[PDB]
Amino acid sequence: QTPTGIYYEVRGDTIYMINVTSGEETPIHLFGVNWFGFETPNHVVHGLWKRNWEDMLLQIKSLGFNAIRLPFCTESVKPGTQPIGIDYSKNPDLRGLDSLQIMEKIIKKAGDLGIFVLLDYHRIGCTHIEPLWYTEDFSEEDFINTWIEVAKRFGKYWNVIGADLKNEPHSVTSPPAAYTDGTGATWGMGNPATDWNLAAERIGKAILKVAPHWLIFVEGTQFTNPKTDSSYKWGYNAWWGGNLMAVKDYPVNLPRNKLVYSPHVYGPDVYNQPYFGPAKGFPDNLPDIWYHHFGYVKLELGYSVVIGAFGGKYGHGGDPRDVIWQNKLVDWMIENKFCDFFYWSWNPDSGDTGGILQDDWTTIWEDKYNNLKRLMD
Ligand SMILES: OC[C@H]1O[C@@H](O[C@H]2[C@H](O)[C@@H](O)[C@H](O[C@H]3[C@H](O)[C@@H](O)[C@H](O[C@H]4[C@H](O)[C@@H](O)[C@H](O)O[C@@H]4CO)O[C@@H]3CO)O[C@@H]2CO)[C@H](O)[C@@H](O)[C@@H]1O
């Protein structure tokens, strides 16, 4: 039931942490951040060329966080991979090892601070986010077998709540072609080879045999199926990993208490959505959009919903209307009790969102930040 003694499960729409020995059943809430860079060639979380890692953690935590999502790619996971671009004068603690260890160690330090960790299979390649959980030179079986391996080492770390099966399933072409052309993910279309809802069942089942104590995080797709997407005005405008409109009629076939739907959502910085325009309704049009794209999955369906990645900067690195966006969003999450989230990113170098911070990998965006603590409150 659990090697660790800690069993994670979903009750109602709340994530519970259950100490199987003592019997304590504790509802937990995830106030997290995305510590990216493990889905990269540098093979390490970023910003370490300017600072020490626990300072990052300590700094993280002290800001009020209890969980971090660690994006990774296939190589980061296999033994001999070497990171790159780090300043050892600052971090001389880890000597000679597999981005897997700095990784393992990062997880270790996080738990001492009582921080939970969500493992995310971000990229098969260390370059970009493929639209599918397989490629010409990398098969689904290779993907699943890799998730199994990852479910073994990292399975033992008590603060690891589960697996984000695949980071941002999406399309690389537009509908109606995208639906039946096989280059992109779908949901409720029919073909088990592109339907993420069926693939998620196959991958998740494999993961639960090895880590039955874990939670299965299933993100949305970009497009699902013509009938579903055409049912809502902004149906064709959801984010990669942000379309959960097909959950009602095409629920992933996995035990309800192990399943967590994890949509991704963003503002003006990442991509200039059309409903972001005052002409259409920004920003008061936002509640109904979030609702339709994924909100109803918890509010109406009763499933556990965790925002796996959202972020940007109420700010200047670029666009201002992002201020109104991140505001209206946190307001919204509070009104509806969406208290489990993962900010993107704690890394200032997200050319489209920066971290929760600033490039001298030192200071945090005060206002961008004061807005987010409200939720943790
Ligand atoms: O991983 C480290 C790396 O991260 C980079 O940031 C990534 C984001 O993490 C990722 O979520 C983001 O994905 C975007 C994509 O770039 C946009 O082009 C795409 O826009 C979509 C839109 O979402 C759809 O609604 C619309 O219909 O189609 C458009 C595309 O035409 O939206 C997705 C998110 O849903 O990509 C970022 C990178 O570009 C950092 O930038 C990098 O520095 C970090 O090293």
Short mmCIF file of C-alpha atoms and ligand atoms in Angstrom, two decimals:
data_model
loop_
_atom_site.label_atom_id
_atom_site.label_comp_id
_atom_site.label_asym_id
_atom_site.label_seq_id
_atom_site.Cartn_x
_atom_site.Cartn_y
_atom_site.Cartn_z
CA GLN A 1 0.00 0.00 0.00
CA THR A 2 3.08 2.13 0.63
CA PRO A 3 6.76 1.32 1.08
CA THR A 4 7.28 4.62 2.86
CA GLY A 5 4.44 4.35 5.37
CA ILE A 6 2.92 7.52 3.94
CA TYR A 7 -0.09 6.95 1.67
CA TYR A 8 -1.47 9.82 -0.41
CA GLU A 9 -5.06 9.71 -1.57
CA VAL A 10 -7.96 11.91 -2.62
CA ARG A 11 -11.10 12.29 -0.53
CA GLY A 12 -13.86 14.50 -1.86
CA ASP A 13 -11.73 17.02 -3.73
CA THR A 14 -9.07 17.24 -1.01
CA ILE A 15 -5.64 15.61 -0.96
CA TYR A 16 -5.01 13.62 2.20
CA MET A 17 -1.73 12.49 3.68
CA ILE A 18 -2.18 9.28 5.61
CA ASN A 19 0.41 7.93 8.04
CA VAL A 20 -0.53 4.24 7.85
CA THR A 21 1.16 3.39 11.15
CA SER A 22 -0.15 6.12 13.44
CA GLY A 23 -3.40 6.34 11.53
CA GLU A 24 -3.24 10.12 11.23
CA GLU A 25 -5.19 11.28 8.18
CA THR A 26 -4.26 14.85 7.32
CA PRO A 27 -5.77 17.11 4.65
CA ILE A 28 -2.95 18.93 2.90
CA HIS A 29 -2.83 21.93 0.65
CA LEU A 30 -0.12 22.61 -1.90
CA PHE A 31 1.28 26.16 -2.04
CA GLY A 32 3.99 25.41 -4.57
CA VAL A 33 6.52 26.65 -7.06
CA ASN A 34 8.10 25.23 -10.18
CA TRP A 35 11.84 24.69 -9.80
CA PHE A 36 12.64 24.14 -13.48
CA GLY A 37 15.89 23.31 -15.22
CA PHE A 38 15.83 19.54 -14.79
CA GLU A 39 14.18 19.22 -18.20
CA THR A 40 17.31 20.78 -19.65
CA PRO A 41 20.83 20.13 -21.01
CA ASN A 42 22.36 22.00 -18.06
CA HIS A 43 20.52 19.17 -16.32
CA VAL A 44 19.93 21.17 -13.18
CA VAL A 45 17.46 23.60 -11.83
CA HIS A 46 18.42 27.11 -12.97
CA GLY A 47 19.87 30.15 -11.23
CA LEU A 48 22.62 28.14 -9.61
CA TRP A 49 25.28 30.09 -11.53
CA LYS A 50 24.47 32.97 -9.23
CA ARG A 51 23.64 31.24 -5.92
CA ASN A 52 23.48 28.32 -3.47
CA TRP A 53 20.57 25.85 -3.65
CA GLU A 54 19.22 25.70 -0.07
CA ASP A 55 19.25 29.48 -0.03
CA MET A 56 16.85 28.93 -2.91
CA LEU A 57 14.86 26.48 -0.80
CA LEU A 58 15.14 28.41 2.45
CA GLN A 59 14.23 31.50 0.46
CA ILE A 60 11.36 29.54 -1.14
CA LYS A 61 9.92 28.22 2.10
CA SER A 62 10.34 31.36 4.14
CA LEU A 63 8.14 33.03 1.52
CA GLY A 64 5.42 30.58 2.57
CA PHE A 65 5.75 27.46 0.36
CA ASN A 66 5.28 23.79 1.19
CA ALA A 67 5.71 22.19 -2.26
CA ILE A 68 7.79 22.30 -5.44
CA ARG A 69 7.20 20.72 -8.85
CA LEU A 70 10.41 19.38 -10.39
CA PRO A 71 10.22 19.25 -14.21
CA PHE A 72 12.57 16.65 -15.67
CA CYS A 73 13.49 15.06 -18.99
CA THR A 74 14.56 11.49 -19.79
CA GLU A 75 18.35 12.01 -19.51
CA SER A 76 18.17 13.87 -16.19
CA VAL A 77 16.70 10.58 -14.97
CA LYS A 78 19.30 8.09 -16.26
CA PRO A 79 22.48 7.66 -14.09
CA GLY A 80 25.49 9.26 -15.80
CA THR A 81 24.03 12.57 -16.90
CA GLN A 82 26.19 15.59 -16.04
CA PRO A 83 24.86 18.97 -15.27
CA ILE A 84 26.22 22.20 -16.71
CA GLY A 85 26.52 25.93 -16.04
CA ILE A 86 26.83 25.92 -12.26
CA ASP A 87 29.13 27.91 -9.97
CA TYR A 88 30.88 25.44 -7.66
CA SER A 89 32.52 28.20 -5.64
CA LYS A 90 29.01 28.70 -4.29
CA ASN A 91 27.77 25.08 -4.29
CA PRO A 92 30.62 22.67 -3.36
CA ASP A 93 28.31 20.20 -1.57
CA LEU A 94 27.57 17.73 -4.38
CA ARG A 95 30.77 16.30 -5.89
CA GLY A 96 30.79 14.37 -9.11
CA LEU A 97 27.20 13.37 -9.77
CA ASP A 98 24.10 12.52 -11.76
CA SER A 99 21.69 15.50 -12.07
CA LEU A 100 19.61 12.74 -10.57
CA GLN A 101 21.39 13.28 -7.20
CA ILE A 102 21.48 17.01 -7.11
CA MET A 103 17.84 16.26 -7.92
CA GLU A 104 17.43 13.60 -5.21
CA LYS A 105 19.27 15.88 -2.78
CA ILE A 106 17.07 18.84 -3.73
CA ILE A 107 14.10 16.68 -2.85
CA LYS A 108 15.74 15.67 0.43
CA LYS A 109 16.34 19.23 1.59
CA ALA A 110 12.82 20.18 0.55
CA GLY A 111 11.28 17.53 2.79
CA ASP A 112 13.35 18.46 5.84
CA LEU A 113 11.62 21.83 5.48
CA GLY A 114 8.34 19.95 5.20
CA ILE A 115 8.05 20.75 1.47
CA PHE A 116 6.21 18.27 -0.78
CA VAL A 117 7.53 17.35 -4.23
CA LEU A 118 5.61 16.52 -7.42
CA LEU A 119 7.62 14.69 -10.10
CA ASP A 120 6.89 15.96 -13.62
CA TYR A 121 7.93 14.19 -16.86
CA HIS A 122 8.49 17.45 -18.73
CA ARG A 123 10.22 16.56 -21.97
CA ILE A 124 11.30 13.33 -23.61
CA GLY A 125 13.90 15.52 -25.24
CA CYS A 126 15.99 18.14 -23.47
CA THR A 127 14.98 20.69 -26.09
CA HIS A 128 11.26 21.31 -26.00
CA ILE A 129 7.87 19.95 -25.06
CA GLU A 130 6.88 17.31 -27.59
CA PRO A 131 3.14 17.27 -28.23
CA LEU A 132 2.96 13.57 -27.32
CA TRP A 133 4.34 11.08 -24.81
CA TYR A 134 6.35 9.43 -27.57
CA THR A 135 8.37 10.28 -30.64
CA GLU A 136 9.73 8.41 -33.67
CA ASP A 137 12.87 7.36 -31.80
CA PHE A 138 11.14 7.06 -28.41
CA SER A 139 8.09 4.83 -27.95
CA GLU A 140 5.25 4.79 -25.46
CA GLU A 141 6.66 1.64 -23.89
CA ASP A 142 9.97 3.49 -23.49
CA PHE A 143 8.10 6.37 -21.85
CA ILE A 144 6.16 4.10 -19.50
CA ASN A 145 9.19 1.98 -18.66
CA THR A 146 11.02 5.19 -17.80
CA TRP A 147 8.16 6.30 -15.53
CA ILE A 148 8.47 2.95 -13.80
CA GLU A 149 12.17 3.47 -13.09
CA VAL A 150 11.46 6.98 -11.82
CA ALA A 151 8.68 5.52 -9.67
CA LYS A 152 11.24 3.37 -7.87
CA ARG A 153 14.07 5.60 -6.62
CA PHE A 154 11.94 8.66 -6.00
CA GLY A 155 9.12 6.52 -4.70
CA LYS A 156 10.85 6.18 -1.33
CA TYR A 157 10.99 9.90 -0.58
CA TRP A 158 8.02 10.47 1.74
CA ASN A 159 7.50 14.05 0.55
CA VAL A 160 6.97 12.97 -3.07
CA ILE A 161 3.20 13.02 -3.55
CA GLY A 162 2.97 11.69 -7.08
CA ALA A 163 3.59 11.93 -10.81
CA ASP A 164 2.58 14.55 -13.37
CA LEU A 165 2.36 11.92 -16.14
CA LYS A 166 3.25 14.16 -19.10
CA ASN A 167 3.91 17.84 -19.22
CA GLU A 168 1.51 19.78 -21.43
CA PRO A 169 0.09 17.41 -24.05
CA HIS A 170 -0.69 19.62 -27.06
CA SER A 171 -1.07 19.97 -30.82
CA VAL A 172 1.45 21.15 -33.41
CA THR A 173 -1.20 21.77 -36.07
CA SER A 174 -4.73 23.23 -36.04
CA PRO A 175 -8.24 21.68 -36.17
CA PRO A 176 -9.97 19.90 -37.66
CA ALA A 177 -6.70 18.39 -38.91
CA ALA A 178 -5.11 18.30 -35.42
CA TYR A 179 -7.83 15.87 -34.31
CA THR A 180 -7.13 13.07 -36.80
CA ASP A 181 -3.61 13.71 -38.06
CA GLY A 182 -1.65 11.87 -35.37
CA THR A 183 0.92 14.59 -34.63
CA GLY A 184 -0.95 15.85 -31.59
CA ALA A 185 -2.73 14.79 -28.43
CA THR A 186 -6.53 14.48 -28.33
CA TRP A 187 -9.14 13.55 -25.74
CA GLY A 188 -12.31 11.63 -26.49
CA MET A 189 -11.55 11.33 -30.23
CA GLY A 190 -11.30 7.53 -30.32
CA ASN A 191 -7.76 6.56 -31.27
CA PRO A 192 -6.05 5.31 -28.05
CA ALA A 193 -2.76 6.30 -29.67
CA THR A 194 -3.52 10.04 -29.46
CA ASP A 195 -6.30 10.26 -26.86
CA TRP A 196 -4.56 11.46 -23.67
CA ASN A 197 -7.46 10.23 -21.53
CA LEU A 198 -6.74 6.63 -22.58
CA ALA A 199 -2.95 6.99 -22.55
CA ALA A 200 -3.14 8.48 -19.02
CA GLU A 201 -4.93 5.34 -17.87
CA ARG A 202 -2.26 3.07 -19.36
CA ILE A 203 0.66 5.10 -18.00
CA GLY A 204 -0.96 5.72 -14.62
CA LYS A 205 -1.83 2.07 -14.11
CA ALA A 206 1.81 1.19 -14.71
CA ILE A 207 2.85 3.80 -12.12
CA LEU A 208 0.39 2.65 -9.46
CA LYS A 209 1.67 -0.93 -9.57
CA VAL A 210 5.07 0.37 -8.50
CA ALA A 211 3.94 3.33 -6.35
CA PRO A 212 0.35 2.64 -5.16
CA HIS A 213 0.80 5.25 -2.43
CA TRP A 214 1.29 7.96 -5.07
CA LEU A 215 -1.15 10.35 -6.70
CA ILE A 216 -1.62 10.50 -10.48
CA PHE A 217 -1.52 14.04 -11.84
CA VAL A 218 -3.24 14.28 -15.24
CA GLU A 219 -2.99 17.58 -17.12
CA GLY A 220 -5.36 18.59 -19.88
CA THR A 221 -4.69 18.77 -23.61
CA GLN A 222 -4.97 21.74 -25.96
CA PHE A 223 -7.77 20.36 -28.10
CA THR A 224 -9.95 17.40 -27.16
CA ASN A 225 -12.51 16.45 -29.81
CA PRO A 226 -14.49 18.67 -32.25
CA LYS A 227 -17.83 18.17 -30.50
CA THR A 228 -16.35 19.10 -27.10
CA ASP A 229 -14.22 22.03 -28.22
CA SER A 230 -16.97 23.55 -30.37
CA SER A 231 -19.32 23.47 -27.37
CA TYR A 232 -17.74 26.56 -25.81
CA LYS A 233 -16.83 29.89 -27.44
CA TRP A 234 -13.25 29.79 -26.16
CA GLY A 235 -13.02 26.02 -26.62
CA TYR A 236 -10.37 26.31 -29.31
CA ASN A 237 -8.45 28.76 -27.15
CA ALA A 238 -7.30 26.76 -24.12
CA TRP A 239 -3.65 26.44 -23.14
CA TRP A 240 -1.32 23.53 -23.70
CA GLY A 241 -2.11 21.25 -20.78
CA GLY A 242 -5.08 23.45 -19.99
CA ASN A 243 -8.09 21.84 -21.69
CA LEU A 244 -10.08 19.67 -19.30
CA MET A 245 -13.42 20.23 -21.00
CA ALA A 246 -13.65 16.56 -22.00
CA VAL A 247 -13.39 15.24 -18.42
CA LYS A 248 -17.15 15.10 -17.89
CA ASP A 249 -17.89 12.69 -20.75
CA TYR A 250 -14.44 11.13 -21.05
CA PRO A 251 -13.16 10.71 -17.49
CA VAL A 252 -9.74 9.11 -17.21
CA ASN A 253 -10.34 5.47 -16.13
CA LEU A 254 -8.37 5.35 -12.88
CA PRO A 255 -9.35 5.06 -9.19
CA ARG A 256 -10.95 8.32 -8.09
CA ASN A 257 -8.86 8.48 -4.91
CA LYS A 258 -5.51 8.35 -6.74
CA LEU A 259 -6.48 10.83 -9.46
CA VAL A 260 -5.74 14.56 -9.61
CA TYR A 261 -6.59 16.72 -12.63
CA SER A 262 -3.85 19.32 -13.11
CA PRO A 263 -4.60 22.07 -15.65
CA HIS A 264 -2.07 24.71 -16.72
CA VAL A 265 -3.22 28.28 -17.21
CA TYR A 266 -1.41 31.50 -18.13
CA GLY A 267 -1.70 35.23 -18.74
CA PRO A 268 -0.66 37.86 -21.35
CA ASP A 269 3.10 37.29 -21.12
CA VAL A 270 3.15 33.65 -22.26
CA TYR A 271 0.73 34.05 -25.18
CA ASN A 272 -1.53 36.91 -26.26
CA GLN A 273 -4.93 35.20 -25.94
CA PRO A 274 -7.87 36.93 -27.70
CA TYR A 275 -10.14 36.98 -24.65
CA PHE A 276 -7.39 39.04 -23.03
CA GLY A 277 -8.72 42.01 -24.98
CA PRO A 278 -11.06 44.58 -23.35
CA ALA A 279 -13.06 44.46 -26.57
CA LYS A 280 -13.99 40.88 -25.73
CA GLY A 281 -14.30 41.24 -21.96
CA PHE A 282 -10.95 41.26 -20.15
CA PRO A 283 -10.64 40.89 -17.27
CA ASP A 284 -14.18 40.28 -16.00
CA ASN A 285 -14.73 37.63 -18.67
CA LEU A 286 -12.04 35.52 -16.98
CA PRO A 287 -14.06 33.66 -14.33
CA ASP A 288 -16.34 31.92 -16.84
CA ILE A 289 -13.42 30.99 -19.10
CA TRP A 290 -11.33 29.36 -16.36
CA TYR A 291 -14.51 27.71 -15.17
CA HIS A 292 -15.32 26.12 -18.55
CA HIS A 293 -11.72 25.12 -19.41
CA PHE A 294 -11.11 23.36 -16.08
CA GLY A 295 -12.84 25.00 -13.14
CA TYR A 296 -15.99 22.89 -13.39
CA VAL A 297 -13.89 19.74 -12.86
CA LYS A 298 -13.80 20.52 -9.15
CA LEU A 299 -16.74 22.89 -8.68
CA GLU A 300 -19.27 20.65 -10.43
CA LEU A 301 -17.60 17.25 -10.74
CA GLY A 302 -15.99 17.03 -7.31
CA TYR A 303 -12.56 15.94 -8.53
CA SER A 304 -9.34 17.18 -6.96
CA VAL A 305 -7.97 19.96 -9.16
CA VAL A 306 -4.43 21.31 -8.83
CA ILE A 307 -3.07 24.17 -10.96
CA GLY A 308 0.23 22.64 -12.07
CA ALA A 309 1.68 25.76 -13.64
CA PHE A 310 0.63 29.37 -13.83
CA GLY A 311 2.71 32.49 -13.53
CA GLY A 312 4.19 35.52 -15.25
CA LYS A 313 4.68 38.99 -13.72
CA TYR A 314 2.27 41.70 -12.80
CA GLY A 315 4.99 43.83 -14.32
CA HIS A 316 7.55 45.37 -16.57
CA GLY A 317 9.88 42.70 -17.95
CA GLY A 318 7.05 43.03 -20.37
CA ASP A 319 3.31 43.54 -20.33
CA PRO A 320 1.16 45.34 -17.59
CA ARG A 321 -2.22 43.78 -18.30
CA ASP A 322 -0.63 40.74 -16.74
CA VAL A 323 -1.08 42.55 -13.43
CA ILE A 324 -4.82 42.57 -13.80
CA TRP A 325 -4.67 38.93 -14.90
CA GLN A 326 -2.69 37.49 -12.01
CA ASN A 327 -4.87 39.51 -9.70
CA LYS A 328 -8.23 38.45 -10.98
CA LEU A 329 -6.90 34.88 -10.99
CA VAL A 330 -5.81 34.72 -7.35
CA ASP A 331 -9.04 36.49 -6.42
CA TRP A 332 -10.83 33.72 -8.31
CA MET A 333 -8.88 30.87 -6.74
CA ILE A 334 -9.76 32.24 -3.30
CA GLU A 335 -13.45 32.71 -4.03
CA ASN A 336 -13.68 29.09 -5.15
CA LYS A 337 -11.19 27.45 -2.80
CA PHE A 338 -8.59 26.43 -5.40
CA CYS A 339 -5.81 26.33 -2.83
CA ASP A 340 -3.51 23.78 -4.47
CA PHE A 341 -1.22 25.33 -7.05
CA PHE A 342 2.29 25.47 -8.48
CA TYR A 343 3.59 28.80 -9.56
CA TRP A 344 5.63 29.09 -12.73
CA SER A 345 8.32 29.73 -12.02
CA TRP A 346 10.70 30.28 -9.10
CA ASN A 347 13.12 30.78 -12.00
CA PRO A 348 13.56 34.39 -13.22
CA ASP A 349 14.78 33.25 -16.66
CA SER A 350 11.43 32.19 -18.10
CA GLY A 351 11.69 34.54 -21.05
CA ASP A 352 7.91 34.56 -20.92
CA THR A 353 7.21 34.57 -17.17
CA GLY A 354 10.45 35.00 -15.27
CA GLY A 355 10.54 33.33 -11.90
CA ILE A 356 9.01 34.55 -8.70
CA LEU A 357 11.90 36.83 -8.48
CA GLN A 358 14.29 38.81 -10.59
CA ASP A 359 17.26 38.11 -12.77
CA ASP A 360 19.97 38.98 -10.28
CA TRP A 361 18.84 35.63 -8.98
CA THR A 362 18.36 37.45 -5.67
CA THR A 363 15.27 39.67 -5.17
CA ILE A 364 11.60 38.79 -5.70
CA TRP A 365 8.97 40.82 -7.53
CA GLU A 366 7.37 42.40 -4.46
CA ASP A 367 3.95 43.17 -5.96
CA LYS A 368 3.86 40.20 -8.29
CA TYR A 369 4.54 38.35 -5.04
CA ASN A 370 2.28 40.12 -2.55
CA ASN A 371 -0.61 39.13 -4.80
CA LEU A 372 0.17 35.40 -4.52
CA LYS A 373 0.55 35.16 -0.74
CA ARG A 374 -3.08 36.17 -0.39
CA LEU A 375 -4.10 32.65 -1.42
CA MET A 376 -1.92 30.98 1.17
CA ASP A 377 -3.02 33.96 3.32
O1 LIG B 1 11.25 24.50 -19.29
C1 LIG B 1 12.18 25.57 -19.08
C2 LIG B 1 11.88 26.64 -20.09
O2 LIG B 1 10.51 27.00 -19.94
C3 LIG B 1 10.17 27.98 -20.91
O3 LIG B 1 8.83 28.31 -20.73
C4 LIG B 1 7.92 27.53 -21.52
C5 LIG B 1 6.70 27.26 -20.62
O4 LIG B 1 7.11 26.50 -19.47
C6 LIG B 1 5.65 26.48 -21.42
O5 LIG B 1 4.52 26.25 -20.57
C7 LIG B 1 5.29 27.41 -22.62
O6 LIG B 1 4.32 26.75 -23.37
C8 LIG B 1 3.50 27.73 -24.07
C9 LIG B 1 4.05 27.95 -25.49
O7 LIG B 1 5.37 28.51 -25.44
C10 LIG B 1 3.14 28.93 -26.21
O8 LIG B 1 3.63 29.14 -27.54
C11 LIG B 1 1.76 28.31 -26.24
O9 LIG B 1 0.93 29.20 -26.92
C12 LIG B 1 -0.25 28.51 -27.45
C13 LIG B 1 -1.48 28.82 -26.60
O10 LIG B 1 -1.22 28.35 -25.27
C14 LIG B 1 -2.71 28.15 -27.18
O11 LIG B 1 -3.79 28.55 -26.35
C15 LIG B 1 -2.85 28.79 -28.59
O12 LIG B 1 -4.02 28.45 -29.18
O13 LIG B 1 -1.78 28.35 -29.45
C16 LIG B 1 -0.54 28.97 -28.91
C17 LIG B 1 0.70 28.58 -29.78
O14 LIG B 1 0.49 29.03 -31.10
O15 LIG B 1 1.26 28.14 -24.88
C18 LIG B 1 2.06 27.20 -24.16
C19 LIG B 1 1.53 27.06 -22.72
O16 LIG B 1 0.19 26.61 -22.75
O17 LIG B 1 6.47 27.59 -23.46
C20 LIG B 1 7.44 28.32 -22.75
C21 LIG B 1 8.64 28.52 -23.69
O18 LIG B 1 8.26 29.21 -24.89
C22 LIG B 1 10.99 29.28 -20.70
O19 LIG B 1 10.63 30.26 -21.68
C23 LIG B 1 12.47 28.90 -20.90
O20 LIG B 1 13.31 30.03 -20.73
C24 LIG B 1 12.81 27.85 -19.85
O21 LIG B 1 14.17 27.45 -20.01
#
